[PDB]
């Protein structure tokens, strides 16, 4: 796992632990896991474009990784999709999983769509950031922002929910509203 | 020095393990495109001089008595920090 | 040296974090009198020279490939000891 050491106010990937004795780790407070959203990287934040990056698969257990520090998200998503017959499509959020804390917009996307897998993964391999946990799957009725987690060594509010009605979630023939 | 008291030792240790986490990967690291829970394991054979295997089956036998006591003391359903505690205990006593 | 390969980098890093755990507190440390889960977070801005931010968004991008492999190997639903293991790995190799 890559690590980040802030040398002279400049971040460098610590791929080798034998870098230099200049790097100091006095306490665990210097170690921090920052979860940065993908919106900063410039990816498309549109609902018809963001949902194409999410795919359903079966056989891969969900995994959750903790991150302490987060990034303010200007575009969050709240999937409440269900199967066309009314069956549940996304697993319920377990204890300790809450919505993303800071969200300028919460794209609450509801509707119907095919659910070919027990869990909804990210096609780009990124995580689904939550209140303080990063999960590889999407939980039902929980605000999340698709993002990535970085581990580094530190040196010594209103949400506007947007309603969507999606038919055919996860397919190239998808209609919104 | 390990003395194998087991009635029979298997010289060949056919072992399964997860991926090295640092080896070459393609698109399989993405959970959506990756293999299922069964496919992530990589197999191998460890017919290593037959002394490293029969002494390992005896080390595991002796570890059980202490491990059962350790699990009984712990109040957590699942324990994942046994190696982390062992590293801490080794490093605390080394002091260097 | 970090080369940001992202098409666009956001110079401003508006970050949210929990309380410092060592800062001045009054009656809010009591859960009964404390704030809800939303109110415990403290915000800030990290427009730090723009080099520490664009290189952080690339470090997170590269960390994902190894982090996904690490989570796949682990059999625990939630992982909280990544920093603890990193501290152990750093300290074991330092040996001082």
């Amino acid at each position, epitope marked *: 796992i890559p690590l980040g050491v802030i040398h002279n106010s400049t971040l460098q990937v610590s791929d080798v632990d034998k870098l230099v004795c200049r790097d100091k780790l006095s306490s665990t407070n210097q170690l921090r896991s920052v979860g940065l959203n993908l919106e900063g990287n410039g990816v498309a934040t549109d609902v018809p474009s963001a949902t194409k990056r999410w795919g359903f698969r079966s056989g891969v257990p969900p995994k959750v990784v903790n991150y302490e520090a987060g990034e303010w998200a200007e575009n969050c998503y709240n999937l409440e999709i269900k199967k066309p017959d009314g069956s549940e499509c996304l697993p319920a959020a377990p204890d300790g999983i809450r919505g993303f804390p800071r969200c300028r917009y919460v794209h609450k996307v509801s509707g119907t769509g095919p659910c070919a897998g027990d869990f909804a993964f990210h096609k780009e391999g990124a995580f689904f950031l939550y209140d303080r946990l990063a999960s590889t799957v999407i939980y039902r009725g929980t605000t999340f922002a698709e993002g990535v987690v970085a581990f580094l060594i530190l040196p010594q509010y209103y949400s506007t929910t947007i309603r969507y009605q999606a038919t055919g979630f996860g397919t190239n023939e998808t209609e919104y509203l | 020095a390990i003395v194998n008291a087991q009635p029979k030792c298997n010289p060949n240790l056919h072992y399964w393990t997860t991926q090295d986490e640092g080896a070459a*990967i393609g698109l399989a690291w993405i959970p959506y495109f990756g293999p299922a829970a069964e496919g992530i394991y990589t197999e191998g054979l460890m017919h290593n001089q037959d002394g490293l295997i029969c002494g390992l089956r005896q080390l595991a036998n002796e570890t059980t008595q202490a491990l059962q006591l350790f699990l009984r003391a712990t109040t957590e359903l699942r324990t994942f920090s046994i190696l982390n505690r062992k590293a801490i205990d080794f490093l605390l006593q080394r002091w260097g | 040296a970090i*080369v940001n*390969a992202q098409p666009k980098c956001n110079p401003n890093l508006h970050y949210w974090t929990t309380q410092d755990e060592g800062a001045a507190i009054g009656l809010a440390w009591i859960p009964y009198f404390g704030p809800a889960a939303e109110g415990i977070y403290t915000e800030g801005l990290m427009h730090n020279q723009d080099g520490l931010i664009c290189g952080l968004r690339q470090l997170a991008n590269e960390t994902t490939q190894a982090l996904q492999l690490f989570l796949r190997a682990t059999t625990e639903l939630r992982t909280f000891s990544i920093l603890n293991r990193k501290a152990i790995d750093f300290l074991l190799q330092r040996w001082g």
Partner: single-chain antibody, 221 residues
């Protein structure tokens, strides 16, 4: 942009050893793996081995386990390969390709003259067609690999260029006439309208949890 500048040509005598250093720039060198490919004259692309700058781990093909040695330097950001017991047939053109974030050797280097493994084989080596027609190149995989398949074209006198880095994920800047799609063990690379500039040797590479990233046999139009 990513530029993998490779070393100059060589004429070392048989039995000696040559160290070909390929400099990498425009990206974090330690983050991406470095792969070396040997192209015999008019034969095809042969994968030699891979080196990980982050950890120093290196893997080679069974034929190239002893012939090639891979070392990298983090500070120099340069990947050098040292060969041993060179012969007449060992003299060929060596390419350094950067292993992509998803396993696609997208950026290559300038030509430098000198079972468990997944076997990918193309249906026809010498597909022939006229301009304006539509042809399909089929790549077969021994095992069930994911949509991850890489397609490269290598015009004569130029380094291979990646076109499709997945089943259908098209590299930007590639003409839209190059359309590929496939799944499972079958992958198809199609050209909507073959042109006079599209006749080259096409290679199929599978990148899905397989340490040997062997290329395909080839397809000359």
């Amino acid at each position: 942009q990513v530029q993998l500048q490779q070393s100059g040509t060589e004429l070392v005598k048989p039995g000696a050893s040559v160290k070909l250093s390929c400099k990498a720039s425009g990206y974090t060198f330690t983050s991406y793996w470095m792969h070396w490919v040997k192209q015999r004259p008019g034969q095809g692309l042969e994968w030699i081995g891979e080196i990980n700058p982050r950890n120093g781990r290196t893997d080679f093909s069974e034929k190239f386990k002893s012939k090639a040695t891979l070392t990298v330097d983090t500070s120099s950001s340069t990947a050098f390969i040292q060969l041993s017991s060179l012969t007449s047939e060992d003299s060929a053109v060596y390419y350094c390709a950067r292993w992509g974030y998803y396993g696609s050797s997208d950026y290559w280097g300038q030509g430098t003259a000198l079972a468990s493994d997944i076997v990918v084989t193309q249906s026809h080596k010498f597909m022939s067609t006229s301009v304006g027609d539509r042809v399909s190149i089929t790549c077969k995989a021994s095992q069930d690999v994911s949509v991850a398949v890489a397609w490269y074209q290598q015009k004569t006198g130029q380094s291979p260029k990646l076109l499709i880095y997945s089943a259908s994920y098209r590299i930007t800047g590639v003409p839209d006439r190059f359309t590929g799609s496939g799944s499972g063990t079958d992958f198809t690379f199609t050209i909507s309208s073959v042109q006079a500039e599209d006749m080259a040797v096409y290679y199929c590479q599978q990148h899905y949890s397989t340490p040997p990233w062997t290329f395909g046999g080839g397809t000359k139009l």
